[PDB]
Amino acid sequence: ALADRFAELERRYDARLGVYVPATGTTAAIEYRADERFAFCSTFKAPLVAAVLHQNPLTHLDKLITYTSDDIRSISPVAQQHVATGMTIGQLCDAAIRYSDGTAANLLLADLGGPGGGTAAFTGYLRSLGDTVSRLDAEEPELARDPPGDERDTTTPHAIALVLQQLVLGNALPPDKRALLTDWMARNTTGAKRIRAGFPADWKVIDKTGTGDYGRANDIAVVWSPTGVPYVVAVMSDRAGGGYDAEPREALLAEAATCVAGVLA
Numbered sequence: 001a002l003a004d005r006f007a008e009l010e011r012r013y014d015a016r017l018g019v020y021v022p023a024t025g026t027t028a029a030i031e032y033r034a035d036e037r038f039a040f041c042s043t044f045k046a047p048l049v050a051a052v053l054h055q056n057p058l059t060h061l062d063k064l065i066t067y068t069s070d071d072i073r074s075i076s077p078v079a080q081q082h083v084a085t086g087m088t089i090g091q092l093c094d095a096a097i098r099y100s101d102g103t104a105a106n107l108l109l110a111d112l113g114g115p116g117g118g119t120a121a122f123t124g125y126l127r128s129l130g131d132t133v134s135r136l137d138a139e140e141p142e143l144a145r146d147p148p149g150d151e152r153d154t155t156t157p158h159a160i161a162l163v164l165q166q167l168v169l170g171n172a173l174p175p176d177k178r179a180l181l182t183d184w185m186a187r188n189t190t191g192a193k194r195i196r197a198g199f200p201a202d203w204k205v206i207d208k209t210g211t212g213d214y215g216r217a218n219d220i221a222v223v224w225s226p227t228g229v230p231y232v233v234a235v236m237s238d239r240a241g242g243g244y245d246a247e248p249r250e251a252l253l254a255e256a257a258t259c260v261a262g263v264l265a
């Protein structure tokens with residue numbers, strides 16, 4: 001069944017794969033290594049934006065943040081182009097999710113305040129959603145580079161799925177803020193070859209990707225069936241057998257997602 005197919009994907013890509021799809025009223029949970037730890041990588045940027053939204057009025061989105069070239073210490077497709085002008089908190093949220101912008105993520109972490117440049121506050125926000133598992137210990141780009149087995153900067157497919165479920169389908173955020181998070185994930189630019197590539201075109205997919213060393217490739221998504229039925233899909237992977245320089249394999253995530261989509265259809 002599904003377990004054997006996931007295991008064959010692991011063999012095919014020389015990878016470790018984790019999958020979680022929460023149960024619904026009519027479907028069973030799908031789980032494969034769902035309670036094993038995997039590095040967040042940039043998937044944390046989605047609940048990070050939720051934390052900032054939660055903690056502030058909507059007018060906070062229009063606050064201008066200034067930063068320097070030396071502040072850019074991670075891949076930052078949007079922030080690279082706005083050193084002179086700055087970026088608003090809302091623009092940083094947009095960039096963090098839609099382009100996986102690392103400087104935007106670090107500035108949003110800083111905006112949360114507190115120890116660890118915001119990382120403790122972020123972890124605290126997850127705790128407020130009942131996630132006692134995940135932890136963020138570093139900012140970008142260090143958080144994507146911990147050795148396999150290190151618990152720093154890790155979550156589990158199970159844990160992050162339940163968090164994303166509350167944020168997008170639940171009531172963790174009031175409707176107006178929830179709609180912002182959902183819109184940013186819906187217009188993500190980095191996910192076409194991952195969960196999106198596993199679901200037929202008549203399914204809606206919103207997502208946030210993560211990529212790291214040791215061949216890390218993650219994607220977390222909410223998907224809607226052609227009749228409007230929602231599901232949460234978390235897929236995480238690494239290729240520790242290839243060492244630090246191992247190439248991430250998007251096709252592994254696309255194949256895993258295709259397996260999931262077939263079961264959910």
Ligand SMILES: CCn1ccn(C(=O)N[C@@H](C(=O)N[C@@H](Cc2cccc(C(=O)O)c2)B(O)O)c2ccc(O)cc2)c(=O)c1=O
Pocket residue numbers: 040041042043073074075076099100101102140141143144145209210211212213248
């Ligand atoms: C100081 C210079 N330096 C050094 C290392 N570094 C870094 O490791 N970045 C990982 C990363 O940002 N990851 C974010 C993802 C990201 C964001 C934007 C683009 C890309 C891309 O691959 O094109 C990837 B996240 O935390 O998941 C990363 C790790 C492995 C990769 O194959 C790609 C990027 C830097 O960004 C960096 O600026």
